[PDB]
Design a binder for this molecule. Sequence first.
Ligand SMILES: CCCCC/C=C\C/C=C/CCCCCCCC(=O)OC[C@H](COP(=O)([O-])OCC[N+](C)(C)C)OC(=O)CCCCCCC/C=C/C/C=C/CCCCC
Ligand SMILES: CCCCC/C=C\C/C=C\CCCCCCCC(=O)OC[C@H](COP(=O)([O-])OCC[N+](C)(C)C)OC(=O)CCCCCCC/C=C/C/C=C/CCCCC
Ligand SMILES: O=C(O)COc1ccc(Cl)cc1
Lengths: 322, 322
Amino acid sequence: MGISWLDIYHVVSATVPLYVSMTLGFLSARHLKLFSPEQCAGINKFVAKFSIPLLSFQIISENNPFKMSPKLILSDILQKFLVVVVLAMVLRFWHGGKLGWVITGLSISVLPNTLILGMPILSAIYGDEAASILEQIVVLQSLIWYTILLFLFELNAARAGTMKILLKAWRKLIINPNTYATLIGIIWATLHFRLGWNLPEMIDKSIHLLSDGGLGMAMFSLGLFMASQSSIIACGTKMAIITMLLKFVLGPALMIASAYCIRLKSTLFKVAILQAALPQGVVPFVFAKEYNLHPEIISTGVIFGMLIALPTTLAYYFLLDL
Amino acid sequence: MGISWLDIYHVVSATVPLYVSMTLGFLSARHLKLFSPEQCAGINKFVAKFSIPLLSFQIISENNPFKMSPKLILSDILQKFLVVVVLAMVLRFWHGGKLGWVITGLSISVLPNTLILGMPILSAIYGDEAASILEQIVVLQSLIWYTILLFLFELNAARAGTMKILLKAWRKLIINPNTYATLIGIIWATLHFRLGWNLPEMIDKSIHLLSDGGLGMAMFSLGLFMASQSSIIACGTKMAIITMLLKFVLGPALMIASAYCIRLKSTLFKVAILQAALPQGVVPFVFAKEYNLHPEIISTGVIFGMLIALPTTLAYYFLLDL
Ligand SMILES: CCCCC/C=C\C/C=C/CCCCCCCC(=O)OC[C@H](COP(=O)([O-])OCC[N+](C)(C)C)OC(=O)CCCCCCC/C=C/C/C=C/CCCCC
Ligand SMILES: CCCCC/C=C\C/C=C\CCCCCCCC(=O)OC[C@H](COP(=O)([O-])OCC[N+](C)(C)C)OC(=O)CCCCCCC/C=C/C/C=C/CCCCC
Ligand SMILES: O=C(O)COc1ccc(Cl)cc1
């Protein structure tokens, strides 16, 4: 009972607006019936190609590459290898190519939404201290993982030449606005924190025009998505329970294992094990739907995790105090 | 004479972000092929149903209704009445749909941009005291004129039996967010400023998540629309010239007449007249595009008014200062 009820109010007040901006979208798409499915797709495309890239750019630019945390980087890199080995072991005694189930597992188990709903919740629970750690995690998720996952997707698609696979992955990666956003953000943060350069006021305000409102529109787009599909749970209970258990139990569990091995101390420990408990990302669903690799589970998990994030997040916040 | 380039920099910095958003939309619609007409319509509808009404609520609820100068309100109403009379006279012998032209003549002549270009421009030209007056003008717009304009739009749509048409217009004006928002906002403004009630943090943040970035998305919609037109001057050179005359030679002139009638004096007179020569806002265009009532004319007016916002304002300042 170390955490007082006052902090529970902090978490709830930080999470409620995100759910309001999502319920509004769901009701507008399904009940109020304002947006036709084509209009919903257009809104989602705008949010995922102009708002998310600029939000990622600003988040990555507001961090210091020269003052990163090597321990945190190593812990995050080791967690996603422990997940790979766990999935490989568990796919040998419980199942065509099985590599699809490892790509899906890494998309479902370890890929928290540390960008749209990561900053608010964690920053409210742990103040401004979390912000920097979350940016550090976001740069990695945007530069290393979201690229290796795409490479794995391409390799799976080719299975049906590695050099041909690499060429195709590179060709499809460049057109992604998020890659350009991340690269420019890093290349600019380096200059900002080395030569002391700062954005001109015009550029900063222009970027903030499209990015400062991207967080709410992200959940609005997600609500439109949930409204679009008829069956909330695309598959039976089986998938839903498996994916929820995988994300919320195995994810933070392997993160705890990696942190203990690396001996992360104090706030880094608590903000690094609790950030792996955040609901699922959407980019993995984008990849799955584009390549049609079990898109019926990657979304059943995304929406369910988005619905259930608050109670589990509070539960792990209480647990970490112990 | 003595105007420093610093003020020019302020005006240009306030104006550029809108152009950045508009050009991004235009490129996304024309050089790229991201958005189809239905998706652009969906984005515009979202902006007209979720962002503009929330911004209206914020503007109304953040201003005291008991500390608004009645003289300014009366002068604004007089200007609108004079413009309506003048346009009715002009359309009586120098004309298709007469009501379809009054809406577009009151959308580019008596609806400046007093929330983005107006406050920086005319708060740097004059002292900070004009901020309160401009805020009064903006709340008056969002409270009265943006409701009367939507009523006229719905009345025009119904026409496309006087009692039946008015009944249809009213029944369509009671299920529009921009009508309930301007009522809830004023009620809450009165409550907060006469009883001390403060909006809860959760609701305020939830409103911010959506309203924020509304201007960027609206200008993106304007760029997307302008991409459809064959040329930037979609309404034609004659129509562009007449729009410029309506917005920069008729608006300010009739506002000067209104101020003389109501005897406004001191900086209030200058702040009231010099704020009517600012480029027309985008909300009229958003509503026109949503209701498809000569959107090209208003879009051209906005595009070619944001370019010459500054020189006309300097001319008017020099005239008034004399
Ligand atoms: C606590 C102290 C009090 C503080 C003040 C209270 C709240 C904070 C203020 C927020 C500003 C919101 C302004 C817009 C509200 C009015 C919209 C609305 O209420 O009516 C939408 C309308 C529903 O009626 P209907 O059209 O289905 O016709 C029904 C016909 N028959 C009855 C026969 C079935 O539908 C439509 O057409 C259009 C649908 C779009 C609606 C979206 C508009 C923008 C957002 C509205 C909700 C706000 C969310 C943020 C805050 C939420 C948490 C408080
Ligand atoms: C050699 C000549 C060819 C190259 C042309 C020249 C430059 C292009 C590269 C960079 C220019 C910077 C603009 C931002 C990057 C986006 C460029 C781009 O083209 O993206 C690729 C893509 C278009 O691919 P596609 O044409 O095949 O259409 C198909 C696309 N699809 C299949 C996805 C639908 O674009 C999209 O879809 C949407 C892109 C939206 C971009 C939104 C902004 C991204 C964030 C930027 C952060 C920067 C902030 C400024 C900081 C300044 C610091 C000093
Ligand atoms: O039209 C006006 O006077 C105010 O101009 C705007 C300001 C913000 C938005 Cl989001 C849209 C329009």
